[PDB]
């Protein structure tokens, strides 16, 4: 109809285009920073995987309560999401994968208690229902271990008491700077898959264990759990 309103609409769309370009460049810088940060952090995880393989091959006769395998009952989940939208709908993909997995679990007649660390999960996925012991949010970009310390610690403590048996984590898998996919993983029983490392090359002496024989392993196990959840969170941030 009126030409002036059409011109105003054109100008508004031009301004929106400019601001969205600016946001694209900002996302580029942040993605590069997250990539370099996680690349820096990866060798520590590789070293700790090497050391856990080293110790499990050193003393395989003694197994902690996490090495347990009690019958499946009252499984758990870990959900990591974003604090804001405009993310191309990966959060909905993760939520739908988790909803189908938990539907299968309910078909197996097992109730679920899980921890949520993404703001979108607590703000939206909670609106329907679900028992949550840890609902941390607003962790921010590149948080610290102190920021996310007790959220999984209390859940692991509940696992130790026997109320929890299986603990799951789900996030987005970084495969290419343009493409990503959801992931499902199980971490609590620390089930071994590659145990042939260092068997063929020396290491027949192991360790004398002067301070403690097999007591110090619990601390490194909790450190390992923290490391895996932290790396999953940062991977999700980069994918976002």
């Amino acid at each position: 109809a009126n030409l002036k309103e059409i011109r105003a609409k054109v100008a508004s769309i031009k301004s929106t285009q400019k601001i969205t370009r600016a946001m694209q460049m900002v996302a580029a810088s942040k993605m590069r920073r997250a990539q370099e940060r996680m690349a820096q952090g990866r060798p520590y995880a590789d070293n700790m995987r090497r050391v856990i393989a080293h110790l499990v091959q050193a003393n395989p006769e003694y197994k902690h309560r996490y090495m347990v395998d009690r019958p499946v009952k009252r499984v758990g989940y870990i959900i990591v999401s974003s604090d804001r939208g405009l993310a191309g709908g990966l959060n909905i993909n993760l939520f739908k994968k988790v909803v189908q997995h938990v539907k299968a679990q309910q078909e197996q007649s097992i109730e679920v208690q899980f921890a949520l660390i993404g703001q979108k999960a607590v703000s939206f996925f909670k609106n329907y229902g679900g028992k949550v012991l840890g609902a941390t949010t607003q962790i921010g970009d590149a948080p610290s271990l102190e920021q996310l310390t007790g959220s999984v610690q209390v859940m692991l403590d509940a696992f130790d008491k026997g109320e929890l048996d299986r603990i799951y984590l789900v996030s987005n898998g970084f495969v290419n700077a343009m493409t990503q996919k959801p992931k499902v993983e199980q971490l609590v029983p620390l089930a071994p898959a590659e145990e042939g490392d260092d068997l063929n090359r020396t290491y027949g002496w192991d360790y004398i264990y002067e301070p403690e024989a097999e007591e110090l392993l619990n601390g490194l196990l909790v450190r390992y759990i923290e490391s895996m959840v932290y790396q999953g969170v940062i991977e999700n941030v980069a994918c976002e």
């Binding site: 400019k18 601001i19 370009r21 600016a22 460049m25 900002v26 810088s29 942040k30």
Partner: protein, 128 residues
Amino acid sequence: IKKLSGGIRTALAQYRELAAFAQFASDLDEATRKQLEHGQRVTELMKQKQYAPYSIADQAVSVYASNEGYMADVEVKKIVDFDAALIAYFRSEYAPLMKQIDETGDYNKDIEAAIKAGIESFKATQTY
């Protein structure tokens, strides 16, 4: 003026080309942030009152001060101030220089050295 206008023209063009990045200032690196701050300073330097024409020498001194780093220290909102202050410190302590510049308009090494020394003296001693 012909020698000195190109720098501010380039600064204004660079500020125009990127303006949406004002809110994400912490995100960009050092060079682009410096470009943003210089563009803001330059675009506030162009403000002027009414019935107050500027002579050739005043424009030359202001543009020379802006083209170097002497305008980086001052706060953005204080750019309108300190400009009249620098001009008023001149014309009373450097009257012959502006008389020569206004009458002739020539440009050489000596004029640049005198302008640099005057700006340095004003920045060192006076207040705005």
